[PDB]
């Protein structure tokens, strides 16, 4: 086990090293504790839900998934949020996606109040017989369109209800699979069908204090490779023109595309972002978030340009090849330590150096900061917030495996 | 030498092949007539211009030389087209800088365009100048640099309005800035707020859409400016939609594997119009001559299938000084035209019906068969009907122009 | 329906057009006849096979007779003489078999069918969809019991391939593809590739006559659930093929974004024996779309034709599309490959080479662009008709008839 | 200025943190000492050389200036390293061309290397010359051009052999050719057969391996040569293995998303050795200064984990003239060293055992935790132990060198 004295000793030296270059480590940690991550429930049960890799101990019930999310949050320092999918409804009533009621989410409101977290929401527009040739809201079939418009409206009603009960705004994220496997003839009509359907879904006004909608594009998915109706361009344009949030998932863009570039091109025009951190490995593979170039650039671009107050950070990944609870903790800690490293830069001075075109100083300093003692500040943050330091939280995972997961 | 009676015979056979699948070749050729390509002047003289005086022989050095070279290229491109100018192609014996240009400095090109029977489009020149400070112009943090380039931007609109009034054809005034960073920036926000404010100042003075409208061209990366581009595609799509201006899509300026033909149908539920710059990137923004490849085929079929040509200006953008510079224009223009024509020769209404009814088998079979239908016989007919050489034959014209003009310079 | 005399007339015109630029259309069609495509059996039944019991289209093959019938139908619409690729799991026997107990006689069904059909056979060992796939690893597993099982399958694939080649009197290319790799970032990249090297050497050790069979080795950049590391890389297998005097398999879907596999041929053939070129359309990943006439296919085919590599390159199809008529999928991909080969053959290649050696890049650009709108379709139509296959749209009639007669009824038919 | 006591206090805590997970920080630093980086001379003078006479002040213009600049950079990079020369950095009062260079023309650099205490690597110069014809050299279809560049190739080996004999350290002699086509070629075979025959002629005359060995460097594409590269990565890996020579991997010269760290373990079952050129591509072969990024982290940890450093020569390759050219070297060298050191500070024996047991949970958790272990405290200790400044402090040295030397030029 890491000795708390060691953490304290390493921190006092780190505090001094950072002070010498005009950085306040105490202030950086206070900033980090204001950034909640929206932890996605569906990693816990391989997005099975309750309505309808192979590591042991998958959650099978609401109680099991709630316990698994409690365990993960207990190993993530600070206070965070949980994302639900519509299919995580908890009810003994026969429901379909077009007959869900707000009170079907009472279980999760009760849990969130006990846990002390806000909730965000996702409509479930997939894994259903009413998905016709990979299309839902923007299907050429009006029966199919009408079904999914009913689900869209219900997702807003559920979100409003949760937000009213919790006293925290529910971000209601819309993702559709809609597109073509092979090359389409008509690219225009599907996107005009989507525009009309979305305008219908958001028509009935709901209190902004309770919920606001975000819209998530994708470049391509398995079996839908050639055309995505809801493109990044379509949804940025839609978000700006309908005054809604735009969702950027770090896994859903071109090879070499840097999603951290988008923020400063959006915010002159738009309201807010839902930034979904996810690791693509050569496709939309939904690998666990790790400290890599993409995460470092996402977190430092939000910190440096002061966009955190208008940017919701959510996790999105599946990994069933590893301990599903560990997966949440790896991804959240990676995101947090990347935010903290960005906060531990002399940003005001670096901005002035850059304004004066001192590219020599900018390169030298940004490179030196990558080997400054940011880990000592992160360890101090973990310890101050009653979470295990470094390798130590593996003990907690092993105990949870023995006591809970391996007994299922 | 192709025999005209052979071209006519092969056309009548192709007309019948296409009629049998519900395609009217006569109508397709009338549709192609209505698509003018904006031919870029700067391929003729390696963007030297006249304002501030590969290695194939016969580069244009004077206005008369460049005007003659563009006349020769247009004589080998069937139908009616347009020419793009850069501000540095001003023709004047007065001492000018980019911030002191006057509309009359372009009288030479208005007179030439009237003679040639073509419209003109325009480009402000925001590069190759001492007032480019650390690769930044309009959105420089230096207010002296900003104010210089804002004066040029305002003057570009004044010139474009004047040309548009004189020609009675709308001048599309394309804005491209190099502005960005070689290496990783700290502040991505402030440069884009500087750009927003400066662009708003440039477009402030009211001018009639009838004479000119501005288009805004983004870039992912350029040589020596690799890490950050102030004017991103997202920034300019947002700006064009917000300010009711045109958005410029250059086929060479996007990510590896990015299909710019995807953008049109995501723009037109929101925006006014496009300036589509066809250009061949080879693994970077290399500005190769446009050829009939996946990208050009997808750009052209996406515009005709979805009926966007009436709101899309098509311009050429490439440099190739390793080949006959006049030939480069004709290859690019003909590649674009035959690609448009192939898209127009599809049974688009029936294919749309089959796709709406989820018959993806028929869509795949038919779209593949159409690639080996006799579209060439229709293209040859279009060339001959518009008094241009067929197939290989226009190399004779290039060789003669080399002998008579280019090789004597 | 096209009129045969219309096709013949359009051909005579195209023949004259090409003759005027020094191209012999008669000779081009004779060259195309000499390129057999190895049509993959597994598109017919979504790689189910018969050993262990995206797309939805009716009429999936469920039995050897049904698959054989489906391949016969597809081949009847593909002009000329071709080959069929088998997978080990397409063994036909009443005897209870595993991948390490298959016998050459288990492929007598396919030998008899190939002889009747007038096609050669290529072979693929099946190193996937099996309980003995341990953490996505087979031949190069760190578990010696798993390694040994898959080495037994590897040796059996060669014995089967040798037997088939002897019976058919046509060399069987025996293609090796392994899924082996990691989902996430590995610590040790060296040891898995040393385990692979040793296991492959053990599989090929016992000599078999080259006239009957030779092995080819297929690399991959990444697969679903195995994204971060592939034990059998393209570099590993090109090195292995050259050093062990075996063929190298290039699958057009298995490389980096923007990677042009047509670049590889001329860097391989100064050193290596032969290629198995697997034409496949990737759409943003290894999606195994039906082959279409696109930049990649045009470049693969013209690079093989221009540089005279067809005599040392076996061309196979590899794609999976169950969202469309599975029989039509074969015909689209086969015809796209053939018409792309034929367009390449209809170029004045000797003169274009001379112009290029003289650095006449102007003539090269103009002529290569003009050739894309020469009447290559009229030569393709003539080739289709001469080889008793339908012209252009006409083969959709044959597919609709096969749907009525076979595919739309098949699910309700008793399996036997 | 960082206090040595701060470095020592942080190191003692880090040493304990690492000891607790079975990692020996003292041993890791001894391992880093055995990895010399081959610092490229041509960053110092923007590849001008002396043979054929960004815009940051103080460019080196003479041998003494460039030698001084390399001494300054090496004085700020901890440990012992090497310097790479290009043929155009010949130092002589004699009239030379690339085909008349003599080994004694490098006596200047042998003497400098001995007094500096470094080994030398070598590069033939196959660019920026009238005898580069249509971007081709050794593999030109013109036998006059081929023969000129074959003579330079043979001379590069004679020079490398002579330097190796004098220094008693093997000179790695790296071959890079620009040879290729701007646009799509008809014949891909014949250029590569011309290259094969020409390279074989260059290496024909036996020279002692104790003095020199050749390495062969491929490229995917270069500016003005985008469509085809005669010397491909496949060609040269095949050539190196076949002719028992070294293969050069430049991290900037591959496809988008290509991970060159994948190549090592596919090469070493077959080949003799590598020359790894660390370089940062930004969307093309842009030759940015090496920084601590995914590519550098993967390159360094792949060499360390699989024990390939003793068969892999690590060289720098970048040119950035927009910043202090001496600082560029130090940023790139320190980035490479701290990335090697982080990889050396992992419990690799135990992680390999975990991975063999398919414990992917433990592998993910530990590899992520190690990214925020105190590797900087070990790096700082390495800097201090080897008499170089810690962290930001070496900017003081650069500012002093600017004042005293560079800005006086
Ligand atoms: C969310 C829901 O709200 C009311 O119906 C009650 O307080 C109930 O107990 C609670 O679960
Ligand atoms: C070579 C070719 O063979 C068939 O296609 C026909 O007989 C045709 O007339 C002839 O040109
Ligand atoms: C599960 C589903 O996956 C989609 O690709 C997308 O990332 C959505 O946000 C998520 O709800
Ligand atoms: C010459 C200049 O080049 C730029 O890259 C861009 O394409 C502009 O549109 C053009 O005006
Ligand atoms: C079905 C299997 O798929 C692999 O990805 C590869 O393409 C192999 O060649 C094939 O046998
Ligand atoms: C001995 C003979 O060698 C060939 O190169 C090839 O590898 C054959 O398969 C093998 O049987
Ligand atoms: C300067 C030259 O640049 C090339 O692109 C390559 O990287 C060579 O190694 C180097 O010698
Ligand atoms: Mn998402
Ligand atoms: Mn995803
Ligand atoms: Mn452009
Ligand atoms: Mn361009
Ligand atoms: Mn394959
Ligand atoms: Mn594939
Ligand atoms: Mn290099
Ligand atoms: Mn480089």
């Amino acid at each position: 086990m890491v000795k708390p004295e060691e953490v304290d000793k390493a921190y006092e030296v780190a505090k001094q090293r950072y002070a010498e270059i005009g950085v306040d480590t105490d202030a950086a940690m206070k900033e980090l504790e204001k950034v909640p991550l929206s932890v996605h429930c569906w990693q816990g049960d391989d997005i099975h839900g309750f309505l309808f890799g192979n590591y042991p101990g998958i959650a099978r019930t609401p109680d099991e998934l709630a316990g698994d999310m409690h365990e993960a949050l207990s190993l993530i320092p600070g206070k965070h949020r949980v994302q639900l999918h519509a299919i995580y409804a908890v009810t003994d009533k026969k429901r379909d996606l077009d007959t869900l009621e707000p009170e079907d989410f009472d279980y999760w409101i009760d849990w969130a109040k006990q846990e002390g977290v806000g909730l965000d929401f996702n409509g479930t527009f997939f894994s259903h017989p009413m998905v016709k040739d990979n299309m839902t809201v923007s299907s050429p079939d009006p029966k199919v369109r009408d079904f999914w418009i009913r689900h869209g409206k219900i997702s807003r009603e559920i979100s409003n209800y949760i937000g009213e009960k919790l006293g925290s705004q529910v971000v209601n994220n819309f993702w559709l699979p809609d597109g073509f496997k092979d090359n389409p003839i008509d690219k225009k009509t599907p996107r005009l069908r989507l525009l009309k359907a979305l305008d219908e879904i958001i028509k009935d006004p709901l209190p902004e204090k309770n919920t606001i909608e975000s819209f998530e594009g994708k470049l391509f998915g398995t079996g839908i490779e050639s055309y995505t109706t809801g493109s990044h361009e379509f949804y940025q344009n839609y978000a700006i023109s309908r005054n809604k949030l735009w969702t950027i998932d770090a896994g859903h863009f071109h090879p070499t595309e840097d999603v951290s570039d988008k923020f400063s091109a959006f915010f002159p025009f738009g309201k807010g972002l839902f930034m979904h951190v996810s690791r693509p490995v050569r496709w939309d593979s939904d690998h666990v978030v790790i400290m890599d170039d993409a995460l470092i650039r996402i977190t430092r671009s939000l910190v440096r340009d002061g966009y955190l107050d208008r940017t919701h950070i959510g996790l999105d990944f599946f990994d069933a090849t590893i301990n599903r609870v560990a997966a949440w903790v790896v991804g959240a800690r990676a995101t947090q330590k990347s935010l903290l490293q960005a906060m531990l830069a002399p940003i005001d001075q670096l901005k002035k150096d850059e304004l004066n075109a001192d590219f020599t100083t900018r390169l030298i300093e940004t490179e030196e900061l990558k080997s400054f003692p940011f880990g000592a500040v992160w360890d101090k943050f973990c310890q101050d917030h009653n979470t295990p330091v470094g390798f130590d939280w593996m003990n907690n995972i092993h105990q949870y495996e023995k006591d809970v997961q391996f007994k299922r």
Side-chain angles (χ1 to χ4, degrees), chain A:
Chain A
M1 302 289 293
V2 179
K3 308 190 76 134
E5 292 75 25
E6 291 172 325
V7 172
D8 286 350
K9 225 98 75 63
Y11 180 67
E12 281 316 308
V13 175
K15 177 171 180 185
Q16 182 59 25
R17 282 297 303 279
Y18 278 113
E20 283 165 13
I21 64 155
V23 169
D24 182 343
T25 55
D26 294 319
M29 292 193 297
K30 294 294 191 185
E31 288 304 302
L32 180 57
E33 96 190 326
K34 295 183 197 313
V35 187
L37 308 182
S38 206
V39 176
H40 58 304
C41 68
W42 47 100
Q43 158 69 26
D45 74 334
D46 301 358
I47 202 150
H48 290 154
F50 305 126
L51 196 52
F52 308 121
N54 49 333
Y55 202 80
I58 191 182
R60 295 159 308 180
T61 69
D63 281 3
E64 285 180 1
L65 185 58
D68 293 350
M69 291 195 291
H70 174 76
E71 177 62 17
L73 290 170
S74 81
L75 299 173
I76 302 162
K79 288 303 298 187
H80 299 287
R81 294 172 68 79
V82 162
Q83 294 188 62
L84 300 175
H85 247 282
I87 51 165
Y88 290 78
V90 176
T91 176
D92 23 312
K93 285 165 151 197
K94 194 106 188 100
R95 300 293 205 217
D96 205 350
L97 290 178
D98 70 331
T99 65
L100 285 176
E101 309 258 79
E103 62 264 27
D104 297 347
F105 291 86
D106 285 354
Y107 177 93
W108 288 115
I109 292 167
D110 288 3
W111 179 78
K113 291 199 164 175
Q114 158 97 43
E115 184 62 33
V117 296
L119 294 176
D120 300 303
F121 200 79
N122 300 257
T124 311
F125 295 95
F126 58 81
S127 297
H128 194 279
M130 287 303 280
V131 180
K132 188 182 188 188
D133 302 302
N134 309 306
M135 296 183 177
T136 63
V137 168
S138 68
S139 176
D141 186 331
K143 283 182 184 166
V144 170
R145 167 200 86 208
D146 286 355
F147 177 92
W148 291 112
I149 286 177
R150 285 200 300 285
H151 183 63
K153 289 182 176 181
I154 285 171
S155 75
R156 299 182 62 235
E157 291 174 333
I158 294 165
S159 292
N160 181 58
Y161 176 81
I162 295 173
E164 182 61 50
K165 289 295 190 176
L166 288 191
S168 177
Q169 186 195 57
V170 175
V171 181
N172 181 12
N173 186 58
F174 285 77
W175 178 70
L176 311 178
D178 296 30
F180 289 104
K181 178 174 180 161
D182 222 312
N183 293 312
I185 307 301
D186 187 338
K187 296 182 178 185
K188 168 176 63 185
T189 303
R191 282 164 178 178
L192 291 186
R193 286 198 307 262
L194 181 57
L195 188 73
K196 197 173 70 127
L198 292 182
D199 278 353
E200 168 132 74
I201 287 166
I202 63 157
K203 179 196 178 56
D204 295 330
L206 295 169
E208 186 167 346
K209 75 176 187 63
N210 289 345
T211 189
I212 193 165
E213 302 78 26
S214 199
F215 295 87
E216 181 177 4
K218 200 171 183 180
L219 175 61
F220 80 99
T222 307
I224 323 175
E225 287 90 352
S226 291
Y227 172 95
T228 309
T229 310
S231 71
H232 297 310
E233 283 80 13
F234 179 88
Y235 282 129
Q236 181 160 189
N237 289 341
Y238 189 77
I240 291 173
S241 59
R242 275 64 172 167
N243 206 21
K244 303 293 184 179
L245 272 44
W246 181 40
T247 298
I248 300 164
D249 182 307
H252 292 186
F253 290 78
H254 291 86
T256 77
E257 187 151 22
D258 181 359
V259 299
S260 82
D261 183 59
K262 311 307 184 185
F263 311 148
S264 55
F266 172 80
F267 270 121
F269 308 95
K271 179 163 177 82
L273 291 181
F274 198 8
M275 176 74 231
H276 282 196
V277 293
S278 186
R279 173 162 52 118
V281 184
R282 303 208 173 274
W283 71 294
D284 181 29
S285 57
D286 291 333
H287 280 67
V288 174
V289 168
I290 62 172
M291 183 176 198
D292 62 7
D293 285 348
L295 186 59
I296 288 157
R297 286 167 171 185
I298 289 167
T299 56
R300 80 192 187 193
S301 285
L302 289 177
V303 166
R304 287 165 174 185
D305 287 326
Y307 288 142
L308 289 172
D309 65 353
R310 285 174 284 168
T311 304
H312 299 93
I313 306 177
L315 303 188
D316 203 354
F317 47 79
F318 297 93
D319 194 357
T321 71
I322 63 168
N323 188 302
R324 291 174 179 82
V325 167
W328 275 318
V329 183
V330 172
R333 282 192 177 220
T335 304
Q336 287 182 297
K337 76 171 74 172
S338 296
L339 283 162
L340 181 60
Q341 194 184 256
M343 295 173 176
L344 283 171
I347 297 172
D348 285 345
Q349 186 52 50
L350 279 166
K351 282 179 170 175
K352 292 192 225 304
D353 295 334
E354 175 170 84
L355 271 185
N356 287 324
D358 188 356
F359 301 144
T360 307
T361 298
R362 185 186 60 201
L363 181 61
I364 297 173
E365 290 194 2
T366 53
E367 282 311 301
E368 289 306 327
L369 287 167
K370 297 184 170 168
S371 55
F372 261 53
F374 76 93
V377 183
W378 170 240
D379 288 350
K380 180 61 171 171
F381 188 86
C382 288
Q383 179 167 288
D384 281 352
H385 292 89
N386 264 83
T387 63
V389 168
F391 278 31
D392 283 354
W393 65 265
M394 282 190 293
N395 299 324
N396 302 73
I397 297 295
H398 298 160
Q399 195 64 45
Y400 195 68
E401 286 181 336
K402 170 204 283 265
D403 287 349
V404 179
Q405 287 166 307
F406 284 7
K407 293 198 151 117
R408 301 179 172 161

